[PDB]
Amino acid sequence: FGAILSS
Amino acid sequence: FGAILSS
Amino acid sequence: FGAILSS
Amino acid sequence: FGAILSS
Amino acid sequence: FGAILSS
Amino acid sequence: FGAILSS
Amino acid sequence: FGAILSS
Amino acid sequence: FGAILSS
Amino acid sequence: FGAILSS
Amino acid sequence: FGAILSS
Amino acid sequence: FGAILSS
Protein backbone atom coordinates (compact mmCIF):
# COMPACT_ATOMS: atom_id res chain seq x y z
CA PHE A 1 0.00 0.00 0.00
CA GLY A 2 1.03 3.59 -0.18
CA ALA A 3 -0.17 6.57 1.82
CA ILE A 4 0.41 10.35 1.63
CA LEU A 5 -0.73 12.65 4.52
CA SER A 6 -0.43 16.46 4.74
CA SER A 7 -1.57 18.39 7.81
CA PHE B 1 -5.76 18.16 5.69
CA GLY B 2 -4.89 16.14 2.66
CA ALA B 3 -4.70 12.37 2.41
CA ILE B 4 -4.27 9.63 -0.18
CA LEU B 5 -4.33 5.88 0.63
CA SER B 6 -3.95 2.99 -1.85
CA SER B 7 -3.88 -0.70 -1.34
CA PHE C 1 -8.98 0.24 -3.10
CA GLY C 2 -7.95 3.83 -3.28
CA ALA C 3 -9.15 6.81 -1.28
CA ILE C 4 -8.57 10.59 -1.47
CA LEU C 5 -9.71 12.89 1.43
CA SER C 6 -9.41 16.70 1.64
CA SER C 7 -10.54 18.63 4.71
CA PHE D 1 -14.74 18.39 2.59
CA GLY D 2 -13.87 16.38 -0.44
CA ALA D 3 -13.68 12.61 -0.68
CA ILE D 4 -13.25 9.87 -3.28
CA LEU D 5 -13.30 6.12 -2.47
CA SER D 6 -12.93 3.23 -4.95
CA SER D 7 -12.85 -0.46 -4.43
CA PHE E 1 -17.96 0.48 -6.19
CA GLY E 2 -16.93 4.07 -6.37
CA ALA E 3 -18.13 7.05 -4.37
CA ILE E 4 -17.55 10.83 -4.56
CA LEU E 5 -18.69 13.13 -1.67
CA SER E 6 -18.38 16.93 -1.46
CA SER E 7 -19.52 18.87 1.62
CA PHE F 1 -23.54 15.89 7.82
CA GLY F 2 -22.67 13.88 4.79
CA ALA F 3 -22.48 10.10 4.55
CA ILE F 4 -22.05 7.36 1.96
CA LEU F 5 -22.10 3.62 2.77
CA SER F 6 -21.73 0.72 0.28
CA SER F 7 -21.65 -2.97 0.80
CA PHE G 1 -17.78 -2.27 2.13
CA GLY G 2 -16.75 1.32 1.96
CA ALA G 3 -17.95 4.31 3.96
CA ILE G 4 -17.37 8.08 3.76
CA LEU G 5 -18.51 10.38 6.66
CA SER G 6 -18.21 14.19 6.87
CA SER G 7 -19.35 16.12 9.94
CA PHE H 1 -14.57 15.65 10.92
CA GLY H 2 -13.69 13.64 7.89
CA ALA H 3 -13.50 9.86 7.65
CA ILE H 4 -13.07 7.12 5.05
CA LEU H 5 -13.13 3.38 5.86
CA SER H 6 -12.75 0.49 3.38
CA SER H 7 -12.68 -3.21 3.90
CA PHE I 1 -8.80 -2.51 5.23
CA GLY I 2 -7.77 1.09 5.05
CA ALA I 3 -8.97 4.07 7.05
CA ILE I 4 -8.39 7.84 6.86
CA LEU I 5 -9.53 10.14 9.76
CA SER I 6 -9.23 13.95 9.97
CA SER I 7 -10.37 15.88 13.04
CA PHE J 1 -5.59 15.41 14.01
CA GLY J 2 -4.71 13.40 10.99
CA ALA J 3 -4.52 9.62 10.74
CA ILE J 4 -4.09 6.88 8.15
CA LEU J 5 -4.15 3.14 8.96
CA SER J 6 -3.78 0.25 6.48
CA SER J 7 -3.70 -3.44 6.99
CA PHE K 1 0.18 -2.74 8.33
CA GLY K 2 1.21 0.85 8.15
CA ALA K 3 0.01 3.83 10.15
CA ILE K 4 0.58 7.61 9.96
CA LEU K 5 -0.55 9.91 12.85
CA SER K 6 -0.25 13.71 13.06
CA SER K 7 -1.39 15.65 16.14
Q: Which residues pair with G4 in a beta bridge?
A: F4, H4
- Residue E6 to chain D, least CA–CA distance (Å): 5
Method used for this model? X-ray
Please say whether the beta carbons of J6 and I2 come within 8 A.
yes
Q: Measured between alpha carbons, how far is F7 from C3 in angstroms, rounded to an integer?
A: 16
Cβ-nearest to G6 among E1, E3, E5: E5
Q: Measured between alpha carbons, how far is C4 from D5 in angstroms, rounded to an integer?
A: 7
Q: DSSP readout, D1-7?
A: -EEEEE-
Q: Measured between alpha carbons, how far is J4 from K6 in angstroms, rounded to an integer?
A: 9
J2-6/K2-6 β-pairing: antiparallel
Q: DSSP readout, J1-7?
A: -EEEEE-
- Residue I6 to chain H, least CA–CA distance (Å): 5
Q: Which residues pair with C4 in a beta bridge?
A: B4, D4
Hey, are the CB atoms on C1 and D6 less than 8 Å from each other? yes
Please say whether the beta carbons of B3 and I2 come within 8 A.
no
